[PDB]
Paper text:
HIV entry into a host cell requires a critical membrane fusion process mediated by HIV envelope glycoprotein (Env) transmembrane subunit gp41, a direct target of HIV fusion inhibitors that are usually adopted to treat the AIDS patients without response to other antiretroviral therapeutics. Most of HIV fusion inhibitors against gp41 are peptides derived from the helical C-terminal heptad repeat (CHR) of gp41, including a number of currently experimental drugs and T20 (Enfuvirtide, Fuzeon), the first and only gp41-targeting anti-HIV agent approved by the U.S. FDA. These CHR-like peptidic inhibitors in helical form are capable to specifically bind to the homotrimeric gp41 N-terminal heptad repeat (NHR), interfering the formation of a NHR-CHR six-helix bundle (6-HB), which has been proved to be the key step leading to the virus and cell membrane fusion. Finally, by introducing an innovative C-terminal tail of Ile-Asp-Leu (IDL), we succeeded to increase the anti-HIV potency of a CHR-derived peptide (Trp628~Gln653, named CP) by more than 100-fold. Unexpectedly, the crystal structures of CP-IDL in complex with NHR helices at different lengths (N36: Ser546~Leu581, and N43: Val539~Leu581) show that IDL tail is capable to bear two different conformations: a part of an α-helix (with N36) or a hook-like structure (with N43).
Residue numbers in the entry:
A (entry chain B): 538 to 580, 625 to 656
B (entry chain C), C (entry chain A): 538 to 580, 623 to 656
Write the structure that this text describes.
């Protein structure tokens, strides 16, 4: 009882740590994407599909993140 | 009992969402790697980046291993 | 009882896998940051990317803090 409570709370707490890390990593990722796009632009045709997949994965990540924020509990 | 199941399942669901996000972030990261690599090629060659290339291969392999590892461990309650 | 332990241990092992993947992705991410910065420096100066650099740093430190914070909370059953 006291055991299981401390265990599950600890588990729940680290889930919030992992999620917060994932969100920060995503913010970092979007910054790198911008940097690349700006470099391709200083030297963007032929990168249409590349742009599309990025948008695809980015949308999915943002969806999953939002879906995780609501699933999240702070015990 | 009812409390335990709901709390546990909720935790299991949360983990599957975190994993899915990690996978999509990995797919996203590999796209940026290529993007950089193609820029480096467009500007002596890609010489001097052999070690850089190495660590990427190292971490990429490790991530993919850990992901597959997490897929086989993951449960869909 | 036997059910709960096996289920809770499985969950904890999964968290360990997810965390390790996040650390490896972070290593990979920092490699991409370097690659970009070196291309920016090889093509006026890196002026105008001050704010960009600052946010990279901001999120990077936050990630590393969150990672270390998760390594402590981490248990191996």
């Amino acid at each position: 009882a006291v055991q299981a409570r401390q265990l599950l709370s600890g588990i729940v707490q680290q889930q919030n740590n992992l999620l917060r890390a994932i969100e920060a990593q995503q913010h970092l990722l979007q910054l790198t994407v911008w940097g690349i796009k700006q470099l391709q632009a200083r030297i963007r045709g032929g990168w249409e599909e590349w742009d599309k997949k990025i948008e695809e994965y980015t949308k999915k990540i943002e969806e999953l993140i939002k879906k995780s924020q609501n699933q999240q509990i702070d015990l």
